[PDB]
Amino acid sequence: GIFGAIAGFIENGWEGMVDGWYGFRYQNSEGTGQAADLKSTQAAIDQINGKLNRVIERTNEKFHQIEKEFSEVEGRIQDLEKYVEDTKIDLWSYNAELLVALENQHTIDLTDAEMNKLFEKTRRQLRENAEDMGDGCFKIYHKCDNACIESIRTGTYDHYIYRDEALNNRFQSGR
């Protein structure tokens, strides 16, 4: 978690989120509700799909090769046929161990990115009509019904509409 989204400011994942990978939960003047975000879910899956085919090639048809098992002790040629294969197998084993590691490192932090990007995207919509609670969660300072919540998800949320209401609810305090 390089961004600190997943396993960071988001305490944990929702085991009851079936529709997508990333998404929203809310509570408003119509009770609680859940939705998925398809733009971000598709964004991650398109990177994980065929992840391996972008590096390792369509397996090629190999036919007659050297012998790799002998039943007769016979010195230097055999000893070379062994060294040639033994060198090969070690070089491939390393490649596999390396590829898996860094290809997994990529998948982890690629999915963490989407989570952080989804967060900053909605944070940039609310602007000063809301408050990051540190919880991967917002306190929106105005009544935002299910149609109004959709306005955030679909990205057409006009903040100037609710700006006056947002300040009344925010400032009621001095000392």
Binding site: V73, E74, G75, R76, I77
Partner: peptide, 12 residues
């Protein structure tokens, strides 16, 4: 004849 091999065989 084939010293190299006999050596390797003995060595092993």
């Amino acid at each position: 004849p084939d010293y190299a091999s006999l050596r390797s065989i003995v060595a092993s």
